[PDB]
Write a protein that binds this ligand. Structure first.
Ligand SMILES: CCCCCCCCCCCCCCCCCC(=O)OC[C@H](COP(=O)([O-])OCC[N+](C)(C)C)OC(=O)CCCCCCCCCCCCCCCCC
Ligand SMILES: CCCCCCCCCCCCCCCCCC(=O)OC[C@H](COP(=O)([O-])OCC[N+](C)(C)C)OC(=O)CCCCCCCCCCCCCCCCC
Ligand SMILES: CCCCCCCCCCCCCCCCCC(=O)OC[C@H](COP(=O)([O-])OCC[N+](C)(C)C)OC(=O)CCCCCCCCCCCCCCCCC
Ligand SMILES: CCCCCCCCCCCCCCCCCC(=O)OC[C@H](COP(=O)([O-])OCC[N+](C)(C)C)OC(=O)CCCCCCCCCCCCCCCCC
Ligand SMILES: CCCCCCCCCCCC(=O)OC[C@H](COP(=O)(O)OCC[N+](C)(C)C)OC(=O)CCCCCCCCCCC
Ligand SMILES: CCCCCCCCCCCC(=O)OC[C@H](COP(=O)(O)OCC[N+](C)(C)C)OC(=O)CCCCCCCCCCC
Ligand SMILES: CCCCCCCCCCCC(=O)OC[C@H](COP(=O)(O)OCC[N+](C)(C)C)OC(=O)CCCCCCCCCCC
Ligand SMILES: CCCCCCCCCCCC(=O)OC[C@H](COP(=O)(O)OCC[N+](C)(C)C)OC(=O)CCCCCCCCCCC
Ligand SMILES: CCCCCCCCCCCC(=O)OC[C@H](COP(=O)(O)OCC[N+](C)(C)C)OC(=O)CCCCCCCCCCC
Ligand SMILES: *C/C=C(C)/C=C/C=C(C)/C=C/C1=C(C)CCCC1(C)C
Ligand SMILES: *C/C=C(C)/C=C/C=C(C)/C=C/C1=C(C)CCCC1(C)C
Ligand SMILES: *C/C=C(C)/C=C/C=C(C)/C=C/C1=C(C)CCCC1(C)C
Ligand SMILES: *C/C=C(C)/C=C/C=C(C)/C=C/C1=C(C)CCCC1(C)C
Ligand SMILES: *C/C=C(C)/C=C/C=C(C)/C=C/C1=C(C)CCCC1(C)C
Ligand SMILES: CCCCCCCCCCCCCCCCCC
Ligand SMILES: CCCCCCCCCCCCCCCC
Ligand SMILES: CCCCCCCCCCCCCCCC
Ligand SMILES: CCCCCCCCCCCCCCCC
Ligand SMILES: CCCCCCCCCCCCCCCC
Ligand SMILES: CCCCCCCCCCCCCCCC
Ligand SMILES: [Cl-]
Ligand SMILES: [Cl-]
Ligand SMILES: [Cl-]
Ligand SMILES: [Cl-]
Ligand SMILES: [Cl-]
Ligand SMILES: [Cl-]
Ligand SMILES: [Cl-]
Ligand SMILES: [Cl-]
Ligand SMILES: [Cl-]
Ligand SMILES: [Cl-]
Lengths: 263, 263, 263, 263, 263
C-alpha cells in the first residue's frame, strides 16, 4: 500500500461524506465549462486565450474527479456495518499527474491578462512551467512514502516546496510590477486574485501533510475536503475572476460586445 | 445508517416508481440545457449572464440526479419478492452538498433581471450567498440525525430555517422595491416568479421532515416525489421564467434579435 | 410484479430483436438532435422556438430509451437456452413519466407554427397541457394493473382516453381553423402533419392494451415494436415536418437564410 | 442461437483483433462528426443539408458500433486459454436495424448535390427509401437462418439482392443523367463517388454470405473486418467526398466562405 | 498470450502509476479538443482545415485512451498484495489500429500549412498515406510476436522501419523546400515543428522494442510512460504548434480576427 486512504475502514457517514464531496466537484467543473463557453464571446480576441485556458482546466479536472469518484465507490463495500477495501486500491496520484497539465494552464492565463507580450511572455511562461513540473514530480515521489517512510515524505516535501517558493516569487513579481498598466480599474481586482491564489494554493501542501499529523480516517476525511475546496477555489473561482478581469479590460480597450455586456 | 432510505425494503411498484422519477429528472435537466443554449442568442448581452447561470444549474443538477439514479439501482436487488439493500448504502446528502453551488446561481440570476447594478449587486449577492451557505450547512448536519436522534434533526432544522427566513426576506425586499423599474410589462411576470419560488422552495423543508412524520417506505416514496417536483419547479420552470423576463426586457431596450424573437 | 415483461422467458431471437429495436431508438433520437441544431439557423427567430422544442424532445426521449436499453440487458441472462429474469425487474413506466415533459413540447411546437399568438397561445397551451397530464397520470395508474387486474386496466384506460379525445379535439379545431393563414403553401403540409399525429399517437393506446389481447412473450415483442415506431413517428418524423413547415413560412416572410436554404 | 459468432471460441489474438476493429470504428465515426460540424460553415445553405445528413449518419453509426463493442467484451471471457461465451449472446442484427435510418440519409445526401429539386427530388427519394427498406427487412429475416437453415439464408438473400439492384439502377441513372449539370468541375468527382459506392456497398452482401462459405472463427474474423472497412468507406469516406463536392459547387455559385476556404 | 503486459504481476505502485498515466492522457486529449474549437475562429478559412484535423485526432486518440484505461482496471484485480490478471487480457493493439486513421490526419495538417496546393497536395498526400499504412500494418503483425518469437518481432520491425524512413524523407523534403515561402516569420516555427516530430515519433519504435531489451513489469511501466509522452507530444503539442503557425500566416495574409487575436 502507498496511500493511507487504503489503510482504513469508514463509517457510513464518513464514507458517504467523501462520496458527496467528490460527486459535487465533478459537476461544478463541467458546469463552469458551459459558462466559460457562453461568456467567451464578450472577451476581446487579444484576451480570449485566457478564457479558452479555463475551458481546458475545467474539462481536465472534471474528468479526473469523475475517475476518483468512481474508484471510491468501486474500491470499497459495506460489510458488517463499515465500508472496507475490496480487490482494488484507492490513490490520490491521479491528481498529481493531472497537475502536470493544469498548473501551466492556470499560470498562463494570469500572464495573458497581466498584458505580458512576446519575449517576456514566452520567457516567464518557460520558467513557470519548469518550476511547476519540478514541484509536481518531486511531490509525486514524496507521496509514495506516506505509508512507509514519513521521513522520506518530508524530505521530498521540502524539495517540492523549494520550487513552490520560486514559482510564487516570479508570479508576485510580475503581478506587482504590471498592476499599474491594468485597464478598466482591474488593478484592484488583480490583487484580490493574487490573494485568492495564495490561500487556495496553500491548502494543497497542507493536504500533503495530513499523513504526518493525522494518520486515520478523520485525516482521510479532512484531506478529501481540503482537496475539494482547493479545487473549487484554485480553478473555478479563479477562472471566474480572470474572465471578469478580461471583460473589464476588453471594454476599456473599446470592444463593443464587452461594453454591451457591462451596459 | 444515516438515512431512512437505507432502513426499508421496497415493493417492485414503490421501487420502480422512485426509479422512474429519478430517471426523468435527469433528462429534463439535460434537455432544458439545450434550450437555454439555443435561445440565449435572443437575450441582450447585458442580461445574457442570467441565461448562462441557468446552464450552470442545469448541468450541475443533471449530473447529481444521474448519480442518485445509478446509486438507487446499485444499492438494491430484487430478492424474495422485494427490493433489499446490498453492500452499498443510499443517501440524499448528494443534493445537500450540490445546493452549495446551485442556490447562489439561482439567486444571482434573479438579481440580474431585477436590474440591480454595482455596489448594490455585489452587496446583496454577498449577503444572499452567506445566508444560503448557512441554511445548507446546518441542514446537512441536521439530516445526519434522521435515523438516530429526531430531537437533533429538529434543532438543526430550526437554525436552518432561521437563515431561510433572512434569505426570503432580502429577496422579497429587492423584488417589491424594484418591480416598478421593470421593462416590457415584466412587473407582472416577476411577481409570478416570486410566488413560484415560495412554493417550490418550501417543498424542500417538508421533504426534510418526512422522517419525523412518516418513517416508512411510503414516506421514502413521498420524499423522492417532493424532491422531484421541487427540482423541476425551482430550477427548470424558474429558469424558463427568468429567460422570458430577460427577452421581454431585452426587446423593450431595443435589442433587435429579441424584437424579432417576439415578432 | 407490475409489468408482463417480467413474467416471461425469451428465446435468443425474441430477446435479441427487442435489444435491436431499443438500441436503434437511442441513436435515431441523438442523431436527429444534431440535425435540428444545424438547420435551426435557417428558421426565422419568430419560429425558432419550434425547432428548439424538438431538441428538447430528442434529448429527453433519447436518454429514456438509453435507460430502458441498459435495463433490458441487465435484468435478463441467458441460462439453459433462454433469457430469464435475474435480480432486477423491467418496466415501461419510464416512458410514461417522461411523457409528462415531452407531450407538452410536442403540442407547443404545433401551436407556434400555426401562428397562434398571445392570449390564444397561452390559453390553448394551458388547456392542452392539463389535458395531457390528465391522460398520462391516469394511464400510469392503469398500467400498474396489467398483471393483477385487467378490469382495472380497462377502467383507467377509459378515463385516460377521455382526456385523449378532448386533446385531439382542441388540436384539430386549431389546425383546421388556422390552416388558411399558413404561409408558403404549408396549408397542405400542416394537414399531413395532423394525419401523422393521428396514426402515431394511436399506437400508444394499442400498446397499452396488449396485456389484454396478447399476454405472452410475442405480445411483449409487439409492444416494444409498437413503441419504437410510435416514438420515431411521433417525435423524429413529426419534428422534421414541423421544421420544414417553419422554414417554408420563414422564407415567405422574407428571411434570407430560409430563402437561400431553399434556393 | 441465431448468429455464428455465438457458436465458436476464439484465440486471444482473434478475439483481440475483433475488439481492436470495433473500438477503432467507434472513434472514426465520432471524430468525423466534429469535422463535418466545423467545415459545414463553408457550404452554401442550398447544400448544407447534405453535410447535416453526414452528421446524422456519423452519430447513429458511432453509437451502434459502441454497443457492439461493449457487447463483444461482455459476452465472452478468457477461460482455459480461450475466449468463450458466457450468459449473454452476440449478434450483428444491431447493424441491420440501424440501416433502416442510415441508408436513407446516405442516399438523400447524393440527390442533394446532384442538384435534383422538388417533385423529382421527392419522387426519387420515396422510391429509393422503399427499395432500401425492402432490401434491409428481407436481409434481416435472412440472417436469422445463418445457423439453422443455409437454404433459407440464400433464399432471402436473393430477394434482398433484388431490391439492391433496383436501388443501384436508379442511383446510376440519376448520376449519369445529371453529371453534366454539375458545377466547379465536380462531374469528375461525382463519378469517383459512384465507384466508391459500388465497392463499399458490395462488401455488405459478401459479409452476409460468410456463414455459407466460411463457418468458423476465421470466418467470424473476416466478417467483422469486412463490416469495418465497409462502414469506413460507405459512411466516412463517402461523407468526405460529398462534402468536398458541395464546397466546390458552393464556390462556383459564388458563396464567399466557400471561395475563401479554397483560396 | 500476445502482449507481455498480460505475462506479469504488478505492485500497487506500478499498477497505480500506469493507471495514473492512462487517465491523464484521456483528459489532455479531450481538453485540447475544446481549445482547438475555440481558437479555430481566428484562423483564416484557407487554413481552417488544419485546425479541424487536430479536432479529429484529439477525439479519436482520446477515445482509445479511454478504452485502454478501462481495460487496465478490468483486466486486473488486487489479490494477495499484487495485481494479477483475471478473465480478460490486455493489449496495445488498440493503438496500432487507431494510427491507421490518425497518422494521415497528422501528416495532412502539416502539408496544409506548408502551403502545398492542388496536384502537389493530392500527390504527396497519397504517397504519405500509403507509406504510413505500410509502416502500421507491418508493425501490428510484428507485435503479435512479442511473447513468442522475438526474431519475428525484429524482422517485421525492420520492414516497418523501411516505410518510416521513406515517410520521414518526404516530410523533410517538403519542409525544407517550402520553409522560405512561409508567412509571418513561421519559417523559424516550422523547423521547431520538424524537430518535435523527429523526437516524438521516435519514441514509438523504442516502445516497440522494450520486449527485446526489458521483458518485465518495469519494462511494461516504461512502455506505458513512453506511449504517454509520445501521444502528448505527437498530437497535442504538435497540434498547438500547427495552429499557432496557421494563425501567424493568417494574420500576415490580412485576416482581421487573426490580427486582433495577436494585437
Ligand atoms: C460550490 C461552492 C462552494 C465551495 C466552497 C468554495 C470556497 C469559497 C471560496 C472563497 C470565495 C472567494 C470570493 C472571491 C470574490 C472576489 C470579489 C470580487 O471582487 O470579485 C471579483 C470581481 C469584482 O471585484 P472588484 O475588486 O472589481 O470589486 C468590484 C465591486 N464593485 C463592482 C461593486 C465596484 O467580480 C467578479 O465577478 C469575480 C468573480 C465573482 C466571484 C464568484 C463568486 C464567488 C463565490 C460564489 C459561489 C461559488 C460557487 C459557484 C460556482 C459555480 C460556477 C460553475
Ligand atoms: C425542459 C423541460 C420542459 C418543461 C417541463 C415541464 C413541462 C411544462 C410545464 C408547464 C409549462 C412551463 C412553464 C412555463 C414556462 C414559462 C412561461 C414564460 O415564458 O413566461 C411566463 C408566463 C408569462 O406570464 P405574464 O405575467 O406575462 O402573463 C401571461 C402572458 N400573456 C400576457 C402573454 C398571456 O407566465 C406563466 O405562464 C406562468 C408560468 C407558471 C407555470 C407554473 C408551473 C409550476 C408547477 C409545475 C409543476 C410540474 C413539475 C413536475 C412535472 C413537469 C413535467 C416534467
Ligand atoms: C474522419 C477521419 C479520417 C478517416 C480516414 C483516414 C484515412 C484517409 C484515407 C482516405 C481519406 C481521403 C479521402 C477523401 C478525400 C477528400 C475528397 C477530396 O477532396 O476530393 C476527392 C478527390 C478529388 O478528385 P477529383 O475528381 O476532384 O480530381 C482530383 C482533384 N485535384 C485536381 C484537385 C487534384 O478524389 C480522390 O482523391 C478519391 C479519394 C477516395 C478514395 C478513398 C480510398 C479508400 C477506400 C477504402 C479503403 C480504406 C478504408 C479503411 C482504412 C481505415 C482508415 C481509418
Ligand atoms: C504537458 C502535459 C502532461 C505532461 C507531459 C509533458 C509533455 C511532454 C514533454 C515534451 C514537451 C516538449 C515541448 C516543446 C514545445 C516548445 C516549442 C515551442 O513552443 O516553440 C515556441 C513556439 C514559437 O517559437 P518561434 O519559432 O515563433 O520563436 C518564438 C516566438 N516569439 C518571438 C514570438 C517569442 O511557440 C509556439 O509554437 C506557440 C504555442 C506552442 C507552445 C505550447 C507548448 C506547451 C508546452 C508545455 C505543455 C503544457 C501543457 C500541455 C497540455 C495542454 C492541454 C491542452
Ligand atoms: C463569499 C461570498 C462572496 C461571493 C459574491 C461575489 C459577488 C457576486 C458576483 C457579482 C455579480 C456579477 O459578477 O455579475 C455579472 C457582472 C455584471 O455586473 P457589473 O457590470 O459590474 O455591474 C455594474 C453595471 N454598471 C457598469 C452599469 C454600473 O459581470 C458581467 O456582466 C460579466 C460577466 C462575467 C463575469 C463573471 C461573473 C461570475 C458570476 C458567477 C458566480 C456564480
Ligand atoms: C399548466 C401550465 C401552463 C403554462 C403554459 C405556458 C405556455 C407557454 C407560453 C408560450 C411560450 C412560447 O413558446 O413562446 C413565447 C414567446 C412568444 O410570446 P408572444 O406572446 O407570442 O409574443 C407576442 C406578444 N403579443 C401577443 C402581445 C403580440 O416566444 C419567445 O420567443 C419567448 C422565449 C421563450 C421563453 C421560454 C418559454 C418556453 C417554454 C416552453 C417549454 C414548455
Ligand atoms: C432522411 C432524413 C430526412 C431529412 C430531410 C428532411 C428535413 C427537412 C428539413 C428542411 C430543410 C430544407 O431546407 O429542406 C429543403 C430541401 C430541398 O427541397 P425543396 O427546397 O423543397 O426543393 C426545391 C423546391 N423548388 C423546386 C420549389 C425550388 O428538402 C429536403 O431535403 C427534403 C428531402 C425529401 C424528403 C424525402 C421524403 C420521402 C419519404 C418517403 C417515405 C417512404
Ligand atoms: C484524412 C483526410 C480527411 C480530411 C480531408 C477531407 C477534405 C474534404 C473537405 C474539403 C475542405 C477543403 O476546402 O479542402 C481544401 C483542400 C484542397 O483545396 P485547397 O488546397 O484549398 O485548394 C486547391 C488548390 N487550387 C485551388 C489551386 C486548385 O482539400 C484537401 O485537403 C484535399 C484532401 C487531401 C488529399 C486527399 C488524400 C489522398 C487520398 C488517398 C488515400 C488512399
Ligand atoms: C500551454 C497550453 C496552451 C498554450 C497556447 C498555445 C498557442 C496556440 C494558439 C495561439 C493563439 C494566439 O493568437 O496566440 C498569441 C499569443 C502570443 O501573442 P500575444 O500574446 O498577442 O503577444 C503579442 C506580441 N507578439 C506579436 C510579438 C507575439 O500566444 C500565446 O499566448 C502562446 C503562449 C506562449 C507560451 C508558451 C510556453 C512554452 C512552453 C515551453 C516549456 C517547456
Ligand atoms: C488545480 C490544482 C492546483 C492549483 C494545484 C496546486 C498544487 C500545489 C501547489 C502543490 C504543492 C505541493 C508542494 C509545494 C509540496 C508538497 C507536495 C505538493 C506537490 C502537493
Ligand atoms: C435546486 C435547489 C434548491 C432551490 C434548493 C433549496 C433548498 C432549501 C430551501 C433548503 C432548505 C432547508 C430548510 C429551510 C430547513 C431544513 C433544511 C433545508 C436545507 C432542507
Ligand atoms: C412521444 C410520446 C407521445 C406522443 C406519447 C403519446 C401517448 C399517448 C397519446 C398515450 C395515450 C394513452 C391513452 C389514450 C389510453 C391508455 C393510456 C395512454 C397513456 C397510453
Ligand atoms: C452504412 C451502411 C450501408 C451503406 C449499408 C448497406 C447495406 C447493404 C447494401 C446490404 C445489402 C444486402 C444485400 C444486397 C443482400 C444480403 C442482405 C444485405 C442486407 C446484407
Ligand atoms: C499519434 C500517433 C503517432 C504519431 C504514431 C506514430 C507511430 C509510429 C511512428 C510507429 C512506428 C513503428 C515503427 C517505425 C517500427 C516498429 C513498429 C511501429 C509501427 C511502432
Ligand atoms: C492467432 C491469430 C493472430 C491474430 C489474427 C488476426 C491477424 C491480424 C493481422 C491483420 C493485419 C493487421 C491489420 C491492421 C489494420 C487494421 C485494418 C482496419
Ligand atoms: C458522522 C460523520 C460525518 C462527517 C461529515 C460531516 C461534515 C459536516 C460539514 C458539512 C459541509 C457541507 C459543505 C461542503 C463543502 C464544499
Ligand atoms: C522537469 C522539471 C525539473 C525542474 C527544472 C528546473 C527549472 C526550475 C527553476 C527555474 C527558475 C528560473 C527562474 C529564472 C528567471 C527569474
Ligand atoms: C404503487 C407505488 C406508487 C405509485 C404512484 C402512482 C401515482 C402516479 C404518479 C403520476 C405519474 C408521474 C408523476 C410525475 C411527476 C413529475
Ligand atoms: C425468432 C423471432 C424473432 C422476431 C423478429 C423478426 C422481425 C422481422 C424484422 C423486422 C424488420 C426490422 C425493422 C424495424 C425498425 C423500425
Ligand atoms: C507525463 C507525466 C509523468 C508524471 C511524472 C510522475 C513522477 C514519476 C516517478 C515515479 C514513478 C513510479 C514508479 C512505481 C513506484 C513503485
Ligand atoms: Cl483583441
Ligand atoms: Cl487537476
Ligand atoms: Cl446588452
Ligand atoms: Cl442541486
Ligand atoms: Cl423573425
Ligand atoms: Cl418520451
Ligand atoms: Cl445558398
Ligand atoms: Cl449503421
Ligand atoms: Cl481564407
Ligand atoms: Cl492513436
Amino acid at each position: 500500500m502507498k496511500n493511507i486512504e487504503s489503510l482504513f475502514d469508514y463509517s457510513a457517514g464518513q464514507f458517504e461524506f467523501i462520496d458527496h464531496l467528490l460527486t459535487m466537484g465533478v459537476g461544478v467543473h463541467f458546469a463552469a465549462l458551459i459558462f466559460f463557453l457562453v461568456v467567451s464571446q464578450f472577451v476581446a480576441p487579444k484576451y480570449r486565450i485566457a478564457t479558452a485556458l479555463s475551458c481546458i482546466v475545467m474539462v481536465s479536472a472534471g474528468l479526473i474527479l469523475n475517475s476518483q469518484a468512481v474508484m471510491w465507490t468501486d474500491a470499497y463495500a459495506y460489510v458488517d456495518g463499515s465500508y472496507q477495501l475490496q480487490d482494488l486500491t484507492f490513490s490520490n496520484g491521479y491528481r498529481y499527474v493531472n497537475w502536470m497539465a493544469t498548473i501551466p494552464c492556470l499560470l498562463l492565463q494570469l500572464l495573458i491578462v497581466l498584458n505580458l507580450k512576446g519575449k517576456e511572455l514566452f520567457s516567464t511562461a518557460t520558467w513557470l512551467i519548469l518550476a511547476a513540473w519540478g514541484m509536481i514530480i518531486t511531490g509525486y515521489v514524496g507521496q509514495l512514502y506516506e505509508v512507509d517512510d514519513i521521513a522520506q515524505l518530508m524530505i521530498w516535501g521540502a524539495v517540492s516546496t523549494a520550487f513552490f517558493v520560486v514559482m510564487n516569487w516570479i508570479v508576485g513579481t510580475k503581478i506587482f510590477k504590471n498592476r499599474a498598466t491594468m485597464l478598466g480599474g482591474t488593478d484592484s481586482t488583480i490583487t484580490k486574485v493574487f490573494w485568492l491564489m495564495m490561500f487556495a494554493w496553500t491548502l494543497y501542501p497542507i493536504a500533503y501533510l495530513v499523513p504526518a499529523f493525522m494518520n486515520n480516517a478523520d485525516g482521510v476525511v479532512l484531506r478529501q475536503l481540503l482537496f475539494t475546496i482547493a479545487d473549487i477555489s484554485s480553478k473555478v473561482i479563479y477562472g471566474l475572476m480572470i474572465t471578469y478581469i478580461a471583460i473589464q479590460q476588453s471594454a476599456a480597450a473599446g470592444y463593443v460586445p464587452a461594453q454591451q455586456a457591462l451596459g
